[PDB]
Assembly symmetry: C5
Homo-oligomer: 287 residues x 5
């Protein structure tokens, strides 16, 4: 064995206060995000609405997931005057985060594929692979770090992390391919944003496998604090960073369709205070 | 005697797996509910019953699963690498029946809504399908839970059979109503409705099979299997089926627009392929007003 | 006889499981109903919107009320070797249901009067009487069965049940009159629906006074279970049954107004997959 | 010297009555909130402040009453002697002040919104009415609750008077603003605004009266009366008044449509009598 | 030395405990009323100035929820005794939770002001990024000083990080003031006035917080602790609701102007204090291939 489970380390008051701070700040950030996303939903044509429903879906999940993580944290440690001593439920703080990823991540794939130019079967096939891939990716990490021998077995810990990375690559490929195919068919302005969005998501993803392995280099209140806070900052930045990008895309693509006279939008579309499309109504129709 | 699944002690691995799938399910339903709500106006007023049913069922499922999760947390007491069932452990199974009682009937309504059945033939079908599926569940509940704390092997098997009676009645009514619609629909609609019907009616089989596993003994592993399988079943069927009936309603809505039977204020898309164009109703005067 | 309070009877596990089942199934049924009602709100012209706001209002109340009933139930009984033994809070299970009716019923009256053709003072007067009548009707039953001598006094129990029935009749009259007056001025199709809706509500109402008196024929876990479950089935059927009807009415009346060119509706109106009206916009207007 | 009402032990009959009215109130507000939300677009953009205020106040009232109910359930312990007050029994009365503090000012705004007040005269009135009613409540809170656990008969009466000062200031500001509007309104609008104003300003009297009952002694019966009366008062005033200001906004909206001052995308009705017809704005080119 | 007297160490009278709760809950309810008003009046503003609305609703939602936590922390923070209300371990959380609130609520306040400002392209996106991270850091610093470091007893860190905080504070004030002073020229007289007003309410009020931060240095007392808690609550409510109402009035004026200038169209008439600003208009109907 080399695995020092992070829910074994006792926390100082400073650490316990910092973790809670970032946890709740995260939850509230997601509430603010969810609200913003909901209110700005009709800034996007019916064609790119899957991007919106996915974004709102994932923010809703993240929000609720983080409430559980917060609850688990509050019931996971006991104050002893010698610090905060982990109880049996301390593992749930890490357990709950996997639950989050299991649902939140697949929605992130769907959101990216939605702003991609994939059509018909090529689109539905990609989604199916990306979803099941990312789903499996998380579920594997869960088996290694949590489920199997209370996450103490160094064999399984490393084994399933690798099995996970297999699925990870499958995902990266499917997404990168689907993006690389779209960029040509898009305008210069759209091209740039989709590339940006794809990077923010696929780039950030790297942080997680790195943090997964830190428990191998030992155990400590400081390490455990780092693991918890990093993943929180990671979750917030990726989810809100990426989401904002795919939105800006959907709007650009919507505005383009309006300008190209492919469709009409009942309100004017703006980006950084620069008008993109004008408000228009459909023709009145006789039966 | 019947080996009740809420008698079996769970390992930490098992307790962790059950919770994982339970909460993942609940959150999947949150995501589904939100998606369904946001995409509600992609469907004509004619097929709105399909939407209200889908949102209704996802809302119920969501809340039901919160109860199941709570029951699970209060159903077992930790014992140094093991979780020992308490008196409330039965409620984990009890609560799932409560879910089905409401969630399933809504699934029937949702399918019949996208079907072409018209007038009283339609309203009669719904009435039978609903009461049938309602009774189907309530029966299984009496057998597995209510009667002699679900230990009586007689009642357990008896009411499971009475249940299966109602089950068939439902399958018939639905299959008939679908087989009648498919002819009068287009090729593209025809395919989807058939698909949706299969996902629902096919998946249904899993449940009676899982109901009887308690007869082949009791074990942490079995109990875990029963709980997880039903969760995966619930999620796949409800979200799998729901997505299908939606794609139908949109196709049927787009068709009505193209056929010039109605108008829709936004363009309708499926897999990024345009189906209908946005149109407004003609501006009209009044024969008499203020 | 003599009054055997139903919150005195000990429940078997089978009974305790059945009550909870129906209670929660009810609550969820109301969630589904509330959602459906909300989504289908704009299927009705501004003229008949009072019908919708009332229906959604009552479903919202019912939903929340039943959450309280469920809470009361969970805190009302303690598990023992002898089954589920009533504690002091067991009375609240019955107490809470009265609270529900007090609000949910008056909304049911308003909902029916909304789809009625009553105009001006005749309309506002009817509502005022029906509401206060049904309100008093419930509050009376509450005094008899719960408030007065912890609902053990057989005198008050029967007395106030009668005072209640007085208000009950006043309501039935006001509603029946208001309906019978509308039916003439309505179309054949509307006429039929309003009659149907009125029956479902006014007919079902009978179940409640009947169940009120069962505590006189003794007390048992079986009886208590019957009282609780019957009232739940009653609540669900009446509220959802009736509600669906008044909706079908409002839509028909809305579609008619559109066809008669009296008003316009921005979407096509359907009933059992049969189109009733077509989508229309108002004429664009130039301002002085 | 003052017989605090949270000192009195309650019978079962009393405890059951209080809870009944408390929850019935909360549910009445749920029904009201829902109605208000659904009927929000029956009013022109001009009188929307009336709607946002009404929905705001119903939302507050609803939540406030949930707290009052919770406080009630945690305020008394069942014994051989009935329901005996614990330390938290005061919170039942405490929580109601919290409600008024927010719910009342919104009631002022709602009335001023359907008034014809324009520019500074409007913004000034609101500012005074809000701070006036806010202070009015906060004063009563100091007297009855905060100062010496509301036992000091001096402060109890003192701050009740300071309160009444603010009370009058409010009545004046509102009455003035209404009396100025009634001339510029139609006969039908004139009547409604007067009605609404009475329901609010009239009902207000009940509260100061109930505030002083604790001086004529303490008793389960009195405490029950105080609690139930305030509940009936809250419900009647809030949704009685609210229904009126709504009927006003619709009339004023319909009038603007008929006068060709504005357009409304749906037909407006009152007691089944059509007021305005549905109309769209003219299409605009650029 | 340890001259910092933690406010969560002071025992509270019944009068004080009652006052704190009163203002806490009144605040929460004020935010509920605000959130509702904001949501209902969302479509009084053109798509161009929607970021102003989403930010305001976002911040009111956060404030609302944050205050629920503060209230819960308060109820679990003190135990009633013969000697009044005695602080327990969790009493610090009452102050801890308020920092959490500010961390999110404040940055949204910056975004809301920048949204009604005329900043365009990168100059706009850059300003927001600085203002957000600046205000974020500003709060997080105060948190380290008053709470995290040596349970907020270390007078060194307390004063040190308060200064580091004030650095970020100024950076924010500058970015916002600059962005406002640049907009005022390109705006009308009526808009100019409102934006200036809104900016004052926010930037002016901000001063109260650093002042209250340092009161723990003058000693400790139930009365002081009560003052700290109540003041911050009144501050939060006034700033958030005061400022928010103003930025709204701006967005509407700017929306109405665009309509009158024939730059855009709005489907309903826009009013301010019962004075019409724009008339309802529809976009031209369009036929497609
Ligand atoms: C918003 C939440 C996000 C983006 C979470 C992402 C998580 C991962 C990309 C996790 C990947 C992992 C591996 C590829 C190996 C080790 C185990 C995981 C699950 C951490
Ligand atoms: C989303 C939830 C669904 C589709 C649940 C379905 C449940 C059934 C089809 C249950 C059927 C049963 C029988 C026919 C026999 C044994 C008892 C039941 C209730 C499991
Ligand atoms: C949805 C809930 C409904 C329709 C409840 C109805 C309740 C009644 C009609 C009750 C009537 C009663 C009497 C006329 C006499 C006995 C006491 C009552 C309250 C049960
Ligand atoms: C919906 C709630 C309402 C209208 C509450 C109104 C409360 C008052 C008008 C209270 C006034 C008081 C005085 C003028 C003197 C005594 C103390 C008060 C606060 C009861
Ligand atoms: C609605 C909430 C608001 C506006 C909160 C504002 C808080 C501040 C401006 C805090 C500033 C501080 C300093 C500049 C120094 C001391 C520490 C702080 C965080 C109180
Ligand atoms: C809208 C804010 C809700 C806050 C969450 C509180 C959850 C439930 C608690 C209710 C409070 C109990 C009754 C009042 C006690 C106040 C004690 C005091 O006087 O300080
Ligand atoms: C792998 C589990 C994650 C499931 C998320 C799927 C998103 C649900 C949306 C479906 C719409 C119906
Ligand atoms: C459908 C998935 C079923 C999984 C069952 C897992 C059984 C538990 C393993 C431990 C023995
Ligand atoms: C019934 C409608 C919802 C109830 C929510 C109340 C939440 C407060 C619970 C606080 C309990 C204190 C012990
Ligand atoms: C939708 C109705 C649910 C009621 C929940 C009552 C409390 C159950 C335990 C949590
Ligand atoms: C098992 C004993 C209780 C059974 C009584 C149930 C009565 C249901 C009536 C519904 C109408
Ligand atoms: C932290 C556990 C208790 C949470 C209570 C939240 C209640 C919010 C609504 C009350 C009004
Ligand atoms: C049981 C004695 C107390 C009853 C008081 C009822 C007060 C109602 C006031 C209505 C106005």
């Amino acid at each position: 064995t080399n695995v020092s489970v992070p829910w074994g380390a006792t926390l100082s008051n400073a650490e316990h206060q910092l973790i809670f701070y970032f946890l709740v700040v995260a939850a509230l950030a997601f509430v603010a995000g969810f609200i913003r996303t909901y209110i700005t939903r009709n800034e996007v044509g019916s064609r790119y609405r899957t991007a919106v429903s996915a974004r709102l879906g994932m923010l809703g999940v993240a929000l609720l997931a983080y409430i559980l993580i917060i609850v688990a944290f509050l019931l996971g440690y006991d104050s002893t005057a010698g610090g905060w001593v982990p109880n049996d439920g301390a593992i749930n703080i890490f357990s709950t985060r996997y639950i989050e990823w299991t649902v939140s991540v697949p929605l992130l794939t769907i959101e990216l594929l939605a702003v991609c130019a994939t059509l018909g079967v090529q689109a539905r096939r990609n989604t199916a692979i990306a979803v099941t891939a990312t789903g499996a990716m998380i579920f594997c990490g869960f088996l290694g770090a949590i489920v199997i021998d209370n996450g103490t077995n160094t064999g399984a810990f490393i084994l399933w992390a690798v099995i996970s990375c297999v699925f990870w690559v499958i995902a990266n490929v499917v997404l990168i391919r689907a993006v690389r195919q779209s960029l040509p068919t898009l305008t210069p302005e759209s091209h740039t944003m989709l590339k940006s969005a794809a990077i923010v998501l696929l780039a950030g993803w790297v942080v997680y496998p790195i943090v997964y392995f830190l428990p191998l280099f030992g155990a400590s209140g400081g390490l455990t604090t780092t693991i918890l806070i990093t993943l929180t900052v990671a979750d917030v930045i990726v989810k809100l960073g990426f989401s904002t990008q795919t939105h800006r895309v959907a709007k650009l693509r919507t505005a383009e369709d309006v300008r190209a006279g492919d469709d009409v939008h009942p309100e004017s579309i703006w980006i950084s205070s620069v008008k993109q499309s004008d408000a228009g109504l459909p023709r009145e129709v006789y039966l």
